[PDB]
């Protein structure tokens, strides 16, 4: 998973639309994972 920006409120590069994000970027879709789910992944 391609990460591009955090998911959680507060950490740097925020972004709460995390499927839209990662379909605007160039991605099939995007998931909120890692740690506590703070963590925006991309589906590669």
């Not at 591009?4 to 998931?31: D, L, Q």
């Amino acid at each position: 998973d391609k990460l591009i920006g955090s998911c959680v409120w507060g950490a740097v590069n925020y972004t709460s639309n995390c499927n839209a994000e990662c379909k605007r970027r160039g991605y099939k879709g995007g998931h909120c994972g890692s740690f506590a789910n703070v963590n925006c992944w991309c589906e590669t």
